[PDB]
Amino acid sequence: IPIEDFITPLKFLDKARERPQVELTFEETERRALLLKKWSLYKQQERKMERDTIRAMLEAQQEALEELQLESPKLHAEAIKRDPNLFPFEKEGPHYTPP
Amino acid sequence: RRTPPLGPMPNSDIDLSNLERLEKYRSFDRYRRRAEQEAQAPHWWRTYREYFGRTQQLLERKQAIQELRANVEEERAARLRTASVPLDAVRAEWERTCGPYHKQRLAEYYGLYRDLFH
Amino acid sequence: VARKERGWRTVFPSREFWHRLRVIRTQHHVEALVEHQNGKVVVSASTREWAIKKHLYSTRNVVACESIGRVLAQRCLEAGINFMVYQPTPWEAASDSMKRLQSAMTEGGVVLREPQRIY
Amino acid sequence: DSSRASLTRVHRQAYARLYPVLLVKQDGSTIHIRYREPRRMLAMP
Amino acid sequence: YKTKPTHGIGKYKHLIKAEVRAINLGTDYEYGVLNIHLTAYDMTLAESYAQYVHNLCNSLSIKVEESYAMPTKTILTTHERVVQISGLSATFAEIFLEIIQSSLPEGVRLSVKEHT
Amino acid sequence: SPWRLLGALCLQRPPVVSKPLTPLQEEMASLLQQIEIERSLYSDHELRALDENQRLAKKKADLAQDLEDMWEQKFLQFKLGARITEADEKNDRTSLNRKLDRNLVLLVREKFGDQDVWILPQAEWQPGETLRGTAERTLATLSENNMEAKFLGNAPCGHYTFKFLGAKVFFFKALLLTGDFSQAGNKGHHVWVTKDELGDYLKPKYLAQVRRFVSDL
RNA sequence: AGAGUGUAGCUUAAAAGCACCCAACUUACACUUAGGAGAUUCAAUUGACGCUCUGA
């Protein structure tokens, strides 16, 4: 059924007069630009460590696959064989305070 | 009746079975750059062009670039797009570094060498 | 009086000119060329050159484009080339750096509209 | 790296104020959840 | 022309691909269409994690046919997002599953359920 | 050549407690809250706090504060569970609650004759046994407890071949869902290590390279 | 211990071009625009500082 809840509520139309004021200072926006600079650097670095870890563990797993090929001729057919128990696979996200 | 191509036919190396896994032209500008690159290259067919045709200086430049970018005022003027560049110094340092190359380009285009020195 | 390549209606850019001003915006550098219709380069002006490079904070912004536009303007003012063609694609035609570049070229002294051929 | 998709903002434009109330369902686990009427703690019976 | 050596120099429809069970024959063993359900009480966290997993998908050559969502439910409200993923290796399935496990910001649930 | 068939397992503990935030991340937390307030549009609470106070002032010239006070005192009522059960213990390596913001890896000392090695938990497998079945048997046999974990696939993660009779060691990767870890003070030497102490515990080249397929995050 | 060696992720590039990241439109992706960080491992073609493989 094509019903979606991305339609904006009708109540957000009339009383839009609480904050018409948007005024900052030059030092504040200089800090904003410096923060955007350093965060682009920082999360680019974060993705750099992410891609380094994934390339390291990909090359570890493909080296693992070629070693299992060269040391076991009857185990690679069942090693690449997938497991059917991942159909109802779920994982809850992290929390703050343990029970 | 067909005849085989004389040289290497374009768009031949990329034609495979699965183009869906290949990454993509998401834009237009990249194709314009690559097509200009291919149009610059010579070919075997008939084309429009056929009928109608050290370390110390680098270290000093890196140090100057690091010192110029370390100024708070230059970055503040750059982020506010109000910075300007003096034309006199740039003109003089063009007259120093790479002026002969551009003057040779003008002497090539303005029909000077084929009439003076063959 | 001289002939212009009047065709190429179905392909970009139009070749009906005598001098083309092309701007290449790379990841690192912005570059400007003043060229013939034969493909011969005539006047070049790059941020890949120490003279304009050390006087700029970053080689790609509005400031770098305006400065290299002023430099190319004075270069072609003294080079005796007074009329160009500048054809931007409509997405970066409305861009701020290219509007600033066109304004700097109009203020420099080079008109970016070439006079008509006399038939 | 459980903080990449937590430094967020409302991608819409017609939205009201949201406040990070700490929510607990039944097990004493607090989650910062953006909601109106700026409560501080929640507990579902 | 057909007889000249320059025949088909402008041919392009073979470069144009303009036109579900899992493909598991004997050696190349792949998932079909999947559905990843992201359930959270925050829409900011929900579509932010959806953007993050989609940016992970298009940077790793993963086919994503749709990135739609389902409407919320009255209870507190629950915002749920659907990310469809097709085409993986078994090693690659292990890797993408461990990344989507270890990338959860705050209380977001996962699902590796398939179509229907 | 006689191959000494050996498999193993790399157990992983998912982070129940999220990682602490950088102060720079705190700066974008405050900044994103500020810009969300600046780009919001007249929430009902501020309509019931500003205009109601203006009407009260108009009436006096001729409650949101109580709600905020009771919210503050109810926040002060329920004390938050401590995220740090880590520094107060500082020596409970066998316990599952040694760390909360990082992954935890099972790791067992093993007594051999020609060797004496602190190893990732291993086992011996037969050609008739499945490697996934070997890992399940290792989980159900070695710790002598009641975890319920979850694997991802039969694909491996790291193989290392050391000889003195050929030999090979197989490295998978598991993931604990939950577990009844009865009698936590076992006679074994299982120690949970986030990332660093592995380099303190596992010296040789067949064991100092385990961390390159362990999720460091 | 020996061999292969070496420009940011990639280059039969010579300090470049493709890559990469946020900010804005997009449910989202993508485009575009605004910005950003980048390197020839150190000494005189050669030696030694870093990585991979082959040994114990």
UniProtKB/Swiss-Prot annotation, chain A:
Coiled coil: none annotated. It is found in: Mitochondrion. Transmembrane segments: none annotated. Ubiquitous. Belongs to the mitochondrion-specific ribosomal protein mL40 family. Component of the mitochondrial large ribosomal subunit (mt-LSU). Mature mammalian 55S mitochondrial ribosomes consist of a small (28S) and a large (39S) subunit. The 28S small subunit contains a 12S ribosomal RNA (12S mt-rRNA) and 30 different proteins. The 39S large subunit contains a 16S rRNA (16S mt-rRNA), a copy of mitochondrial valine transfer RNA (mt-tRNA(Val)), which plays an integral structural role, and 52 different proteins. mL40 binds to the major groove of the anticodon stem of mt-tRNA(Val) in the central protuberance. This is Large ribosomal subunit protein mL40. The chain holds residues 83 to 181 of 206 of the full protein.
From Swiss-Prot, chain B:
Signal peptide: none annotated. It comes from the Eukaryota. Residues 54-82 form a coiled coil. It is found in: Mitochondrion. Component of the mitochondrial large ribosomal subunit (mt-LSU). Mature mammalian 55S mitochondrial ribosomes consist of a small (28S) and a large (39S) subunit. The 28S small subunit contains a 12S ribosomal RNA (12S mt-rRNA) and 30 different proteins. The 39S large subunit contains a 16S rRNA (16S mt-rRNA), a copy of mitochondrial valine transfer RNA (mt-tRNA(Val)), which plays an integral structural role, and 52 different proteins. mL38 is located at the central protuberance. Belongs to the phosphatidylethanolamine-binding protein family. Mitochondrion-specific ribosomal protein mL38 subfamily. This is Large ribosomal subunit protein mL38. It comes from Homo sapiens. The lineage of its organism: Eukaryota, Metazoa, Chordata, Craniata, Vertebrata. The chain holds residues 27 to 163 of 380 of the full protein.
From Swiss-Prot, chain D:
It is found in: Mitochondrion. Belongs to the mitochondrion-specific ribosomal protein mL55 family. This is Large ribosomal subunit protein mL55. It comes from the Eukaryota. Signal peptide: none annotated. Component of the mitochondrial large ribosomal subunit (mt-LSU). Mature mammalian 55S mitochondrial ribosomes consist of a small (28S) and a large (39S) subunit. The 28S small subunit contains a 12S ribosomal RNA (12S mt-rRNA) and 30 different proteins. The 39S large subunit contains a 16S rRNA (16S mt-rRNA), a copy of mitochondrial valine transfer RNA (mt-tRNA(Val)), which plays an integral structural role, and 52 different proteins.
UniProtKB/Swiss-Prot annotation, chain F:
GO terms for molecular function: structural constituent of ribosome. The keyword Mitochondrion applies. GO terms for biological process: mitochondrial translation. The modification N6-acetyllysine is found at K168. It comes from the Eukaryota. Keywords: Acetylation, Mitochondrion, Ribonucleoprotein, Ribosomal protein, Transit peptide. It is found in: Mitochondrion. Component of the mitochondrial large ribosomal subunit (mt-LSU). Mature mammalian 55S mitochondrial ribosomes consist of a small (28S) and a large (39S) subunit. The 28S small subunit contains a 12S ribosomal RNA (12S mt-rRNA) and 30 different proteins. The 39S large subunit contains a 16S rRNA (16S mt-rRNA), a copy of mitochondrial valine transfer RNA (mt-tRNA(Val)), which plays an integral structural role, and 52 different proteins. mL46 is located at the central protuberance. Belongs to the mitochondrion-specific ribosomal protein mL46 family. One of its GO terms (cellular component) is mitochondrial large ribosomal subunit. This is Large ribosomal subunit protein mL46.
